[PDB]
Amino acid sequence: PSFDCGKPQVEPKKCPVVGGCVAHPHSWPWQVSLRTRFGMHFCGGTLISPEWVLTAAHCLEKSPRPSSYKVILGAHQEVNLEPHVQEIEVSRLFLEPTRKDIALLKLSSPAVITDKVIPACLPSPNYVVADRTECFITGWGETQGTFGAGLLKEAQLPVIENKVCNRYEFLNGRVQSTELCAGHLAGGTDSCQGDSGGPLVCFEKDKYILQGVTSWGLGCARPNKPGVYVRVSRFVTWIEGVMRNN
Ligand SMILES: Cc1ccc2cc1NC(=O)CNC(=O)CCCNC(=O)Cc1ccc(cc1)NC(=O)[C@@H](NC(=O)[C@H]1CC[C@H](CN)CC1)Cc1ccc-2cc1
């Protein structure tokens, strides 16, 4: 009974990270915590293969040395990690060559694929997530007084097409075609500090596909200020090349 990508063994709860709700433990088995060698959380990430983790390039601004990074897998807590939690060192860092906010980490050893550690599925190249598509963002980031501090939280957010997101009342032309927007324009529900590099997944047919990587925003959960995510579809060819070649 191998574990197919995108299919959690613990069905994700829905609560239709600031706002949202604490997730069912192990409902997001591709969620990774990027940590200092001393075990401090400072970014999220997504397991896409037993030996590969995808995150935001900005998460690596403090050090270009792989030895400076540790990956936490199968976790729900941020500080009191449970016993089965896998901790794996990084061997090589691969930054996107067009200066985009995405990067791949090759783990020193392959992660053990369990019912609590399963890779996410990648989208088909150039796929454009439709406007209003409900997707989920996950992370151990700040809650801004919304509850769930120190625990893996989730939030279901509608995707906002770039044409709307780039309007003057919103991000005013700051969003690129290699990026996507997601959030409640009314505010209240949004990724926040510590969620960068983490996943934005959408349910497709019977599984979750990685469509976005938490990147940046004008504050968190502010009205008319949706969060910005790197569009994974525009980088699937590059990601597969790196993994096949290295
Ligand atoms: C070692 C290191 C590596 C990388 C970062 C920080 C450190 N930290 C230090 O260098 C000195 N502190 C230590 O060593 C203690 C290490 C442990 N905790 C900390 O630092 C505290 C800590 C501080 C800051 C962060 C994470 C952790 N994050 C961020 O804000 C990252 N944006 C986002 O999340 C955005 C996502 C989208 C959202 C829009 N809705 C807006 C926010 C941008 C970002 C900024 C900094 C880093 C990573 C990402």
Residue among 38, 42, 71 to mutate when testing ligand 1 (max atoms within 8 A of CB): 42
Determination approach: X-ray
DSSP string, 32-99: EEEE-TT--EEEEEEEEETTEEEE-GGGGTT-S-GGG-EEEES-SBSSS--TT-EEEEEEEEEE-TTS
Candidates 216, 227, 153; CA nearest to 183 is 227
Closest residue by CA, ligand 1 atom 36: 196
CA atoms of 68 and 61, how far apart (whole Å): 11
3-state helix, strand, coil in the chain (%, to 5): 10, 35, 55
| Residue list, ligand 1 pocket, CB within 6 Å | 36, 40, 42-43, 58-59, 62, 141, 190-196, 214, 216-217, 220, 227
Active centre residues (catalytic): 58, 101, 196
Q: Domains for the chain: give ranges and CATH numbers.
A: 17-28+120-233 (2.40.10.10), 29-119+234-245 (2.40.10.10)
Residue among 32, 196, 216 to mutate when testing ligand 1 (max atoms within 8 A of CB): 196
Assigned token pair, 18 = 């600031």
Which DSSP category does 243 fall into?
H
In which residue are the tokens 């969003």 written?
175
Resolution (Å) of this entry: 2.1
Indicate the length of the chain as a whole number.
246
